[PDB]
Amino acid sequence: RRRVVITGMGMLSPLGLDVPSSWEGILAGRSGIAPIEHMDLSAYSTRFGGSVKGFNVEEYLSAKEARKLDLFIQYGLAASFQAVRDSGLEVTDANRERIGVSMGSGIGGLTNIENNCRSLFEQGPRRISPFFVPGSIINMVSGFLSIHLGLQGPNYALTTAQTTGTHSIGMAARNIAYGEADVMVAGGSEMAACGLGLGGFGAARALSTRNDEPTRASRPWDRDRDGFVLSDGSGALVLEELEHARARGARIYAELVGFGMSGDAFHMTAPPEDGAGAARCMKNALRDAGLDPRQVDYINAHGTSTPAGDIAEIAAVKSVFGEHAHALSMSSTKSMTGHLLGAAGAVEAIFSVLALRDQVAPPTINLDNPDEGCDLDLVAHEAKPRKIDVALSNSFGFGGTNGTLVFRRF
Amino acid sequence: RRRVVITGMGMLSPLGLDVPSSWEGILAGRSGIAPIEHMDLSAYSTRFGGSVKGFNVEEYLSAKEARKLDLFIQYGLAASFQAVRDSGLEVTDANRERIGVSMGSGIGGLTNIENNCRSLFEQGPRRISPFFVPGSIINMVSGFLSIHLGLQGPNYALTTAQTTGTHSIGMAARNIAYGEADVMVAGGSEMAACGLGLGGFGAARALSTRNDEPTRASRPWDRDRDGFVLSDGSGALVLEELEHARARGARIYAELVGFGMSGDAFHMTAPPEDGAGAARCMKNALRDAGLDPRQVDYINAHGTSTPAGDIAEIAAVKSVFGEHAHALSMSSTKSMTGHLLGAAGAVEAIFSVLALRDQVAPPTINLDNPDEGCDLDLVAHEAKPRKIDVALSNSFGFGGTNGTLVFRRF
Ligand SMILES: Cc1cc(C(=O)NC2CCCC2)[nH]n1
Numbered sequence: 130r131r132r133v134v135i136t137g138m139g140m141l142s143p144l145g146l147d148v149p150s151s152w153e154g155i156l157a158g159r160s161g162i163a164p165i166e167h168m169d170l171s172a173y174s175t176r177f178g179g180s181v182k183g184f185n186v187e188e189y190l191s192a193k194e195a196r197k198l199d200l201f202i203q204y205g206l207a208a209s210f211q212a213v214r215d216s217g218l219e220v221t222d223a224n225r226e227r228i229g230v231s232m233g234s235g236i237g238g239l240t241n242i243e244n245n246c247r248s249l250f251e252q253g254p255r256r257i258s259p260f261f262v263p264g265s266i267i268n269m270v271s272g273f274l275s276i277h278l279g280l281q282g283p284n285y286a287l288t289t290a291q292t293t294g295t296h297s298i299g300m301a302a303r304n305i306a307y308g309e310a311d312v313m314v315a316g317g318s319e320m321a322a323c324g325l326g327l328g329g330f331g332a333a334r335a336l337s338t339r340n341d342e343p344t345r346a347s348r349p350w351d352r353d354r355d356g357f358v359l360s361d362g363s364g365a366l367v368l369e370e371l372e373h374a375r376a377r378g379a380r381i382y383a384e385l386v387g388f389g390m391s392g393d394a395f396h397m398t399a400p401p402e403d404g405a406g407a408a409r410c411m412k413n414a415l416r417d418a419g420l421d422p423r424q425v426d427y428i429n430a431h432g433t434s435t436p437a438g439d440i441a442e443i444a445a446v447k448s449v450f451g452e453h454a455h456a457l458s459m460s461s462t463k464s465m466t467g468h469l470l471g472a473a474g475a476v477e478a479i480f481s482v483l484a485l486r487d488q489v490a491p492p493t494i495n496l497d498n499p500d501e502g503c504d505l506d507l508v509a510h511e512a513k514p515r516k517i518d519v520a521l522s523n524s525f526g527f528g529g530t531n532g533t534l535v536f537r538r539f
Numbered sequence: 540r541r542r543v544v545i546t547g548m549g550m551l552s553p554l555g556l557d558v559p560s561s562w563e564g565i566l567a568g569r570s571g572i573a574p575i576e577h578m579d580l581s582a583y584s585t586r587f588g589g590s591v592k593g594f595n596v597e598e599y600l601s602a603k604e605a606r607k608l609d610l611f612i613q614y615g616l617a618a619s620f621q622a623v624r625d626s627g628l629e630v631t632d633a634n635r636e637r638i639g640v641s642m643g644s645g646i647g648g649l650t651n652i653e654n655n656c657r658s659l660f661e662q663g664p665r666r667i668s669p670f671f672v673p674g675s676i677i678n679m680v681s682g683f684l685s686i687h688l689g690l691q692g693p694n695y696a697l698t699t700a701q702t703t704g705t706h707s708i709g710m711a712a713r714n715i716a717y718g719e720a721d722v723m724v725a726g727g728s729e730m731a732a733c734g735l736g737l738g739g740f741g742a743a744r745a746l747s748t749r750n751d752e753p754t755r756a757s758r759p760w761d762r763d764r765d766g767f768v769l770s771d772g773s774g775a776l777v778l779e780e781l782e783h784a785r786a787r788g789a790r791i792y793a794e795l796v797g798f799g800m801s802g803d804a805f806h807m808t809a810p811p812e813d814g815a816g817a818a819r820c821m822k823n824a825l826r827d828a829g830l831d832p833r834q835v836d837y838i839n840a841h842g843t844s845t846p847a848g849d850i851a852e853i854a855a856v857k858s859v860f861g862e863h864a865h866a867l868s869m870s871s872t873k874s875m876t877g878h879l880l881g882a883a884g885a886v887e888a889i890f891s892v893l894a895l896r897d898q899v900a901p902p903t904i905n906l907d908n909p910d911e912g913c914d915l916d917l918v919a920h921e922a923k924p925r926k927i928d929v930a931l932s933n934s935f936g937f938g939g940t941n942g943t944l945v946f947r948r949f
């Protein structure tokens with residue numbers, strides 16, 4: 130197996146239109162959550178979320194290119210272009226067969242499907258856009274980026290609900306480690322903030338309804354938590370074989386040493402109370418890295434602010450790490466960004482890499498009164514400078530799909 | 540790297556509710572294409588396709604469970620349950636962590652999303668189903684199968700448009716070969732036959748409009764071809780590490796020896812005329828298998844019945860195989876099934892495995908007048924018994940995403 134390093138990162142989040150602006154917000158304990166302005170939610174039980182604010186697609190694409198593509202694809206390309214620029218990588222005829230893309234999404238092109246449905250219901254099929262299918266399907270971030278940059282390596286998309294970004298990054302690393310590629314652009318994007326999204330998650334009673342204090346809604350492990358906050362955005366990493374990186378004098382952020390997957394095999398939406406599945410997933414990731422659990426310094430938790438999910442993740446960490454559970458720091462950056470669904474594992478991979486770069490655990494904000502058994506170092510309220518040699522990032526999704534990435538200082 | 544064998548197969552196709560009935564139809568040159576009965580298409584330019592006929596979900600799930608799930612999920616679970624039964628595999632605490640699922644879809648729950656949109660616009664957001672998200676998203680075939688059967692191994696879904704089934708099977712094989720799993724259920728499902736699907740493909744003028752003779756619409760490499768026929772269904776294979784298979788006395792259909800991926804990096808929907816991307820993909824797959832191109836006996840082509848796609852595949856085969864292009868047999872089973880989009884590579888992987896079992900090349904029906912340059916053995920009209928030690932299955936998709944599987948007699 131070849132070693133895999135991170136040489137580039139890109140992001141759209143509710144905290145910023147790039148990685149440094151997003152990370153500035155994370156370290157300041159800043160909320161990206163606000164009343165949603167782009168549609169009328171007067172009649173809805175949840176009227177707030179994490180929007181990407183001031184996104185300027187024409188920095189990336191022509192107006193012609195942009196009008197073809199659902200926002201989730203625009204957000205995915207934005208993060209991908211940032212990551213590739215950030216990497217310094219030059220695509221040539223000599224290497225274009227060795228550079229691939231795995232950018233995914235949990236739900237994909239809801240907004241495009243809504244707009245085309247309006248036309249379909251009032252006028253019939255002859256008013257559907259000719260670009261509807263290619264502009265709405267999840268693999269078109271990978272598609273468009275490969276066409277724009279001339280990437281001829283492995284070209285695919287993961288769709289594992291709220292685990293998508295973690296799985297995308299993990300399986301791209303495997304492509305590089307086993308020699309299918311030298312470089313991969315990997316991560317996820319999501320724009321589910323439309324009637325179907327807020328209505329669909331609303332119908333399932335999954336969302337916080339703290340409309341009077343949106344910035345306090347997302348409160349992972351707090352006793353007053355009442356469901357997750359819906360957010361939009363994208364994260365992309367350039368993953369690179371280490372000798373390829375060293376050969377072109379690339380700036381290396383960190384090393385990707387481990388990837389874990391598991392299924393709960395439990396319930397469509399609910400996690401098992403003891404986090405059995407998450408525990409198997411983290412152990413698979415540590416074994417993959419060849420690490421002792423005692424080597425883990427920081428966990429970026431799934432930590433969605435759901436009653437069942439938050440406690441299951443505490444249980445899984447205590448199971449995997451035993452007494453070391455009291456030495457490591459664990460935080461949920463979802464306290465600040467909310468839940469970017471399929472993009473969550475991408476942006477949280479990036480926050481884990483920067484926790485290594487800056488030797489700082491991001492805070493869990495709004496953790497005013499930790500719930501029964503939530504007695505680990507959850508980095509309540511304020512960022513905590515500490516030694517971090519190994520960082521873990523967990524995602525768990527609908528269908529009991531689990532993913533863990535292990536990152537280490539290089 | 541461990542060896543990977545096929546021990547089980549399952550299918551819903553326009554030709555049958557299982558593999559044997561589907562394969563019987565394939566070998567008889569029978570069309571599964573008919574005017575669509577489940578909706579009014581009077582306003583649409585294409586009014587026919589490959590429907591699954593007489594599907595009884597209650598053979599698999601309760602009516603209660605089924606009502607929550609989009610047909611693409613029902614179809615994916617049906618094929619998955621069949622494949623696992625066909626394998627003889629017994630899931631226990633001893634092996635459940637070593638059995639995973641990778642069932643994908645090109646477009647996913649379009650019909651469910653359309654119905655929930657109609658409700659949203661016409662009655663309001665309180666008429667969106669509470670089960671809308673988990674009943675519609677692409678990872679929930681892998682999700683629900685893992686819950687029903689107790690599979691705790693790697694749990695994920697690919698979405699690479701019309702390449703999804705090929706990629707799903709190929710990357711599941713990699714999971715087994717590199718020791719992440721001993722068993723994987725892999726394939727794809729699609730039900731895109733709704734307003735948005737037929738309208739979206741209609742808007743792009745991608746579909747055959749031979750409404751007066753639906754069974755003659757799908758005519759790959761024929762000079763009178765006028766676009767692809769939209770079909771619904773599912774394919775699942777049980778992939779298994781060879782020693783695991785031998786240890787439980789499993790019936791082995793064939794060995795999965797090679798997997799290729801590539802990006803065209805050419806166009807969002809059109810293939811390059813010379814099939815450069817398809818040619819790279821097949822060459823990657825053959826080198827992966829460690830084969831001489833002259834060892835290939837049968838190719839199950841993508842062969843969608845599009846003007847550009849059909850000729851590009853001939854060019855790519857001539858590029859990869861030189862003079863051996865005239866010795867091998869190549870057929871499109873899409874002549875009979877139509878285009879199952881994300882499920883196409885799954886059902887066609889199964890047809891390639893049975894071509895090995897039965898030593899027969901399936902026909903390309905409706906190939907009355909081969910087009911200029913389409914001068915290979917395309918098995919026009921009737922099945923051809925011949926020696927087949929190695930069978931290739933090609934898929935190409937939107938975003939220039941290519942996949943090739945290589946199967947060999949065991
Ligand atoms: C911020 C930011 C990053 C970019 C960028 O990558 N520019 C595009 C020009 C054509 C493709 C990439 N723009 N704004």
Ligand SMILES: [Mg+2]
Pocket residue numbers: 569570571572753754755756757874875876877
């Ligand atoms: Mg036919």
